[PDB]
Amino acid sequence: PSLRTQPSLYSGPFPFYRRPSELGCFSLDAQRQYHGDARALRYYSPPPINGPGPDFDLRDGYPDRYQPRDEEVQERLDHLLRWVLEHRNQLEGGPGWLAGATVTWRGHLTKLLTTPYERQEGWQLAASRFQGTLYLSEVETPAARAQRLARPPLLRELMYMGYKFEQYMCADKPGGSPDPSGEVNTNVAYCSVLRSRLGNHPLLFSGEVDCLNPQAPCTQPPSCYVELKTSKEMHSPGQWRSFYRHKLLKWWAQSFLPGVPHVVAGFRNPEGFVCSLKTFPTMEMFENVRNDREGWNPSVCMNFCAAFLSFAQSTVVQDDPRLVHLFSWEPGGPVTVSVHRDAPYAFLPSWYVETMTQ
Numbered sequence: 348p349s350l351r352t353q354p355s356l357y358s359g360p361f362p363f364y365r366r367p368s369e370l371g372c373f374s375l376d377a378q379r380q381y382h383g384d385a386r387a388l389r390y391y392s393p394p395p396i397n398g399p400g401p402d403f404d405l406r407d408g409y410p411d412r413y414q415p416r417d418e419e420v421q422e423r424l425d426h427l428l429r430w431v432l433e434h435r436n437q438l439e440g441g442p443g444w445l446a447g448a449t450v451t452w453r454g455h456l457t458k459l460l461t462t463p464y465e466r467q468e469g470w471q472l473a474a475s476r477f478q479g480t481l482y483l484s485e486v487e488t489p490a491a492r493a494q495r496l497a498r499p500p501l502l503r504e505l506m507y508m509g510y511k512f513e514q515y516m517c518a519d520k521p522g523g524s525p526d527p528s529g530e531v532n533t534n535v536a537y538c539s540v541l542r543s544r545l546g547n548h549p550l551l552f553s554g555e556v557d558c559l560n561p562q563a564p565c566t567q568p569p570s571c572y573v574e575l576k577t578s579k580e581m582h583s584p585g586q587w588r589s590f591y592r593h594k595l596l597k598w599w600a601q602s603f604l605p606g607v608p609h610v611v612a613g614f615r616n617p618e619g620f621v622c623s624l625k626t627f628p629t630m631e632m633f634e635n636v637r638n639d640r641e642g643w644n645p646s647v648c649m650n651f652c653a654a655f656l657s658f659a660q661s662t663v664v665q666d667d668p669r670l671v672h673l674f675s676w677e678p679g680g681p682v683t684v685s686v687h688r689d690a691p692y693a694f695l696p697s698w699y700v701e702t703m704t705q
């Protein structure tokens with residue numbers, strides 16, 4: 348009952364990954380309330396050309412204008428499940444497409460993609476099959492939970508600075524000027540709901556989207572979306588090389604799955620200011636490591652992910668929303684499976700199960 352993760356096992360040709368299409372969206376407001384619309388979407392608004400360059404003081408507003416989301420509340424798939432409930436009769440494909448699909452969060456798939464190269468943080472994924480559909484929901488590991496409650500001040504401030512960068516680069520209205528005098532409230536989120544397919548595995552997943560570029564060439568989502576990122580300033584080829592090997596892998600995996608074509612990075616100096624920007628097209632990120640003996644390979648990422656979905660599908664035989672197959676993985680080891688029922692691992696809520704049953 349095990350799945351190996353070594354990169355050399357997955358080194359063949361790039362598998363088929365269907366162009367993702369956006370089926371819908373939803374927003375979570377400042378009170379973490381769900382709305383089935385795009386009210387939370389912000390608009391890409393980078394520093395005006397022929398004006399002063401970026402000069403963003405991410406160290407502005409922390410912590411008195413910071414309203415961090417309560418991470419103790421474990422929402423699991425609940426918001427995505429509400430979207431599915433409100434769109435189940437109106438999904439594309441045809442009869443029984445949902446019954447053949449795997450439903451999860453984009454970030455869960457990102458963790459699968461990076462697993463062959465990940466050497467720091469393990470994970471756990473709870474799986475339940477219900478009306479044919481395979482649902483995947485991450486479980487916080489004991490080490491992750493302990494790390495979270497013991498987050499050092501530096502890490503808490505670094506997390507704020509990543510969200511603060513968005514406030515310098517986005518506006519509430521197209522063409523608007525970004526307003527950093529306000530609050531960073533990380534309850535607020537705009538999520539895109541996407542359909543794709545990896546190999547023979549249809550996928551339905553949602554992902555948080557940083558902003559929309561109204562000047563983007565392609566007007567149809569997800570091609571108009573932009574991912575915003577921060578990273579430390581780099582000054583030597585060796586620093587850039589380490590960035591290419593480790594960070595860009597994570598950025599690629601996150602933006603490749605939903606079809607977000609550009610990541611815009613602000614580089615922060617040690618005093619907390621962003622004074623330079625650079626755009627990384629998702630489809631060109633691998634070029635930085637293609638001829639690197641210590642690089643990553645997107646074919647390995649996707650072939651492993653396909654192998655895991657096959658492994659999970661074959662492992663979860665029983666159609667039962669109270670039954671959970673927990674997939675556990677630590678760096679260097681295989682993915683292992685354990686079986687559980689009801690609390691605490693069961694994650695499909697009665698309100699979803701009963702509505703789908705009726």
Ligand SMILES: Nc1ncnc2c1ncn2[C@@H]1O[C@H](COP(=O)(O)O)[C@@H](OP(=O)(O)O)[C@H]1O
Pocket residue numbers: 505506507508509510512557575576577578
């Ligand atoms: N797994 C994680 N652990 C701790 N902080 C995280 C995190 N994922 C995201 N963050 C914070 O959320 C911000 C927005 O995420 P995202 O870039 O994916 O849109 C991140 O900014 P950065 O990505 O610039 O570090 C980071 O500050």
Ligand SMILES: [Mg+2]
Pocket residue numbers: 555556557
């Ligand atoms: Mg984001």
Ligand SMILES: [Mg+2]
Pocket residue numbers: 557574575576
């Ligand atoms: Mg971002």
